[PDB]
Amino acid sequence: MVQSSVLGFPRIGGQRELKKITEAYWSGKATVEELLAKGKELREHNWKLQQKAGVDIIPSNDFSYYDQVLDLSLLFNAIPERYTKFDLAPIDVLFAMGRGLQAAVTALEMVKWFDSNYHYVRPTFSHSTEFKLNTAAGIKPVDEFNEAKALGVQTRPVILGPVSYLYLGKADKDSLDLEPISLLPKILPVYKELLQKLKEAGAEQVQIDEPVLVLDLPEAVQSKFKEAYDALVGADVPELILTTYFGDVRPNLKAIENLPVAGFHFDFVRVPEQLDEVASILKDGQTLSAGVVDGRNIWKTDFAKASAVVQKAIEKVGKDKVVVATSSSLLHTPVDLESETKLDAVIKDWFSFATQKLDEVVVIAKNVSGEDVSKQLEANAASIKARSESSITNDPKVQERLTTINEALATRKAAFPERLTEQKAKYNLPLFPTTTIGSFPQTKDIRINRNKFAGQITAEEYEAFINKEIETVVRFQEEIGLDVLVHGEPERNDMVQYFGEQLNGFAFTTNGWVQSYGSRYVRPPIIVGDVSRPKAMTVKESVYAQSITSKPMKGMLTGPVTILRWSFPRDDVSGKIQALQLGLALRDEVNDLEGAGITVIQVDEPAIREGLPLRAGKERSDYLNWAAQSFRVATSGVENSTQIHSHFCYSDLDPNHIKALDADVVSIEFSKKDPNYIQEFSEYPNHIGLGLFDIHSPRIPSKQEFVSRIEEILKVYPASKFWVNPDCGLKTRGWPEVKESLTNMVEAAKEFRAK
Ligand code: MET
Ligand SMILES: [Zn+2]
């Protein structure tokens, strides 16, 4: 009998109860006792759901009030001094590290979890760090194991392992020379103690996550697995199941071929082809947990194919040594498809969210065990086939159009220098031209009226209000003398869904929420089939903004890679194909914008780095090519005098890739730290605006501040190539904050314009 296994369950709650309670606590409306009661109710509900579905191996310690990695830092005392000097109880030290503490001290760094859409709080270490078990704070993994046990639910605790935990951390400000992994001998005793305590509580297995094995690791890091696991394994601890996800472990196979662990988990959804080689290092007795139900997307699993993978594993190691698992934690998928009331039922048939993936791992397990689940198999096969044959999935018009992609469709009519000559004649922009990135402070009035349009006012009262906001922002920008204006984006809720809703090939949920960080959740669009654009998406509001000013107005688009990476993608065609269809769809929008008089156009690609393949090699370089190419397919059709802008949230984004876009103008976050980067673009003729000030702050920089910053840039970068702008948009800043800061930026550029 083959077991089923789930690596973690999302904890936000089917109605977002976790968000409600944590925010009500942070605001001082709910007591800490209320908060902890609601956590217990969620964990119980989630454990019963998995038990009820028949899952054999059910996780604990996967729950968190903010972030699981941060919960480990509390547990092991990786807690910087600054957070400890306030009388704060453990849970509020937690929240302080997580989100900062204001009283009449900044949060720890937020980082993407691999190429997922989740962020974790970076483990931060100093020379002074003393690892030890922090027990007056309760021992969360023990407490939560014990809680499930009193429910009648035996669970498998999940903890991030010692190499991954250190390796993903970073040295604190006061210890810039410290190599986190050099702390391994100090943290291993604390892991051991924790594993002893879990065994004593009755845990017989622990899932110990070492996802850094899917990354490119130095040799001196790969050797630490033997060291760490030799020290942890023994008769006084539970059996350990070393768990990897999101990629390929084979280049690191030498590091784990001789570990004393009880078993391994691999992700055969992202990398099925690694099966033969990873199965070959299993020793006699070790188990193999085959990750075959996707923890990061929402498609109903193909039971035939998934069962074949499991069956290849069984054939290599034996049926008693194989487990059917989710590929990763279901943290990355929404809680429950049954909450969806709007979706067309034919589409819904193609989906499974977290709750449904529970039933899927059970059916697959039973199937390879030899139970008769014929009816589930046939129902599953019929769903798979309905999707594969649907007209939604396959649009011939879109397929034809893909056949037209080439270098020439992705190249501007003439090269930058000739384009510059025509753009200078057309706009006559001054030296140190000033502009912004797009969004302005979101007037409570407008966001009220948004909520009101959603019947209490009709479309035109909606138009008129959107339009007055635009006017306000435009007039504002004229007043302070900015050179290239924006419209403020008041009509836009979300930079991805705003486009997705206007594109063929997308579906949307009402409740398909996934945790992004702390209590902040996203509801991604779903790409269900071939993407195309039936009609103008942005033209109306850009035309209006350009009609009320003689300054040039930027149109504003979200790029193709970002739409792809912030949506749930199709799992039946590649990322590249999706991004190219989206590039072609945006190409039609660019055409319409340009035809209507909108001849300065910005494309925003904040998720470009997020999709970077986790290892170096062919896949990574292919990605960078197709990512730049889909941007070029969107933007390359325009006239030479049309000025194309590209905006990037990442600093220290790959200069080669920036160059590969051949945008007329590039804006980048740079208000943070090292000058060699600016030097990277000095022979590159196209223009660049190194973002001068942190948007995420609220503090007004002086004029002289702005000035000293340029002269650092100009000692590396030519003034003829240089734009002046903020780091990103100002959606989240305050109006008086914004008015003084922009006025200041402009007057600085004007003084440089004069001098
Ligand atoms: C996060 S990049 C998106 C930029 C967008 N145009 C803004 O200014 O809000
Ligand atoms: Zn940005």
**Cα separation of 655 and 658, whole Å?**
5
Residues 398 and 373 in one domain: no
Q: What residue type is 578 in one-letter code?
A: Q
Residue 594 marked ligand-binding: no
Three-state DSSP state, 60: strand
**Cα separation of 114 and 76, whole Å?**
23
Question: Going by C-beta distance under 8 Å and a sequence separation of 6 or more, which residues neighbour residue 681?
Answer: 655, 658, 659, 688, 717, 721
Cβ atoms of residues 474 and 545 within 8 Å = yes
DSSP 123: P
Residues 384 and 415 in one domain: no
Residues 589 and 518 in one domain: no
Helix (H) or strand (E) holding 504: strand 504-507
Q: Distance, CA 494 to ligand 1 centroid (Å)?
A: 10
Choose one of 500, 524, 548: the last residue of a domain: 524
Q: Distance, CA 377 to ligand 2 centroid (Å)?
A: 47
Which residue's CA is minimally distant from atom 4 of ligand 1? 729
Residues 357 and 465 in one domain: no
Residues 395 and 340 in one domain: no
Q: How many domains does the chain have?
A: 2
Residues 404 and 374 in one domain: no
Residues 505 and 518 in one domain: no
Residues 263 and 330 in one domain: yes
Which residue's CA is minimally distant from atom 7 of ligand 1? 729
End-to-end CA distance of the chain: 80
Nearest 5°: phi and psi at 223?
-70, -20
Closest CA to 689 of 712, 666, 664: 666
Q: Distance, CA 116 to ligand 1 centroid (Å)?
A: 21
Residues 316 and 414 in one domain: no
CA atoms within 13 Å, Cβ hemisphere of 58: 27
Residue 566 marked ligand-binding: yes
Please provide the size of the chain in residues: 755
Q: Which atom of ligand 1 is nearest to the CA of 602?
A: 6
Tokens 């397929």 label which residue?
A: 399
- What contacts 24+ positions apart, CB below 8 Å, involve 478-481? 478/549, 478/551, 480/739, 480/742, 480/743, 480/746, 481/434, 481/746, 481/750
DSSP 696: S
DSSP 486: -
Ligand 1 pocket, CB under 6 A: 437-439, 495, 556, 604, 606, 647, 649, 728-729, 731
Residues 180 and 231 in one domain: yes
Residue 649 marked ligand-binding: yes
Candidates 495, 645, 742: which one to mutate for ligand 1, based on the most atoms within 8 Å of Cβ?
Answer: 495
Candidates 435, 436, 437: which one to mutate for ligand 1, based on the most atoms within 8 Å of Cβ?
Answer: 437
How distant, in Å, are the alpha carbons of 373, 521, 742 from that of 604?
A: 48, 21, 21
Helix H, strand E, coil C: the string for 554-609 is: EEEEECHHHHHHCCECCCCCCHHHHHHHHHHHHHHHHHHHHHCCCCEEEEECCCCC
DSSP for 254-314?
A: HHHTT---SEEEEETTT-GGGHHHHHTTPPTT-EEEEEEE-SS--BPP-HHHHHHHHHHHH
Which residue's CA is minimally distant from atom 1 of ligand 1? 606
Candidates 442, 604, 649, 725: which one to mutate for ligand 1, based on the most atoms within 8 Å of Cβ?
Answer: 604
Task: Please name which ligand lies nearest the alpha carbon of 498.
Answer: 1
How distant, in Å, are the alpha carbons of 335, 337, 529 from that of 511?
A: 8, 8, 21
What is the residue range of 55's domain?
A: 1-389+510-524
Q: Distance, CA 613 to ligand 2 centroid (Å)?
A: 22
Task: Please name which ligand lies nearest the alpha carbon of 494.
Answer: 1
**Cα separation of 365 and 418, whole Å?**
64
Cβ atoms of residues 496 and 567 within 8 Å = yes
Helix (H) or strand (E) holding 39: helix 32-53
Q: Distance, CA 553 to ligand 1 centroid (Å)?
A: 15
Choose one of 524, 553, 582: the last residue of a domain: 524
378 class by beta-carbon count within 10 Å (0-12 exposed, 13-18 middle, 19+ buried): exposed
Task: Please name which ligand lies nearest the alpha carbon of 669.
Answer: 2
Residues 13 and 83 in one domain: yes
Residues 504 and 518 in one domain: no
How distant, in Å, are the alpha carbons of 158, 168, 627 from that of 620?
A: 31, 21, 11
Task: Please name which ligand lies nearest the alpha carbon of 671.
Answer: 2
**Cα separation of 131 and 188, whole Å?**
9
Joined together, the tokens standing for residue 64 give: 């968190």
Choose one of 465, 499, 524: the last residue of a domain: 524
- What does this entry list as its resolution, in Å? 2.1
Helix (H) or strand (E) holding 111: strand 110-112
Residue 494 marked ligand-binding: yes
Question: Going by C-beta distance under 8 Å and a sequence separation of 6 or more, which residues neighbour residue 550?
Answer: none
Cβ atoms of residues 627 and 576 within 8 Å = no
Nearest 5°: phi and psi at 323?
-135, 140
Residue 113 marked ligand-binding: no
**Cα separation of 257 and 27, whole Å?**
50
Residue 117 marked ligand-binding: yes
Residues designated catalytic: 696
Identify the CATH number of the domain in which residue 115 sits: 3.20.20.210
Nearest 5°: phi and psi at 378?
-70, -40
Q: Distance, CA 588 to ligand 1 centroid (Å)?
A: 21
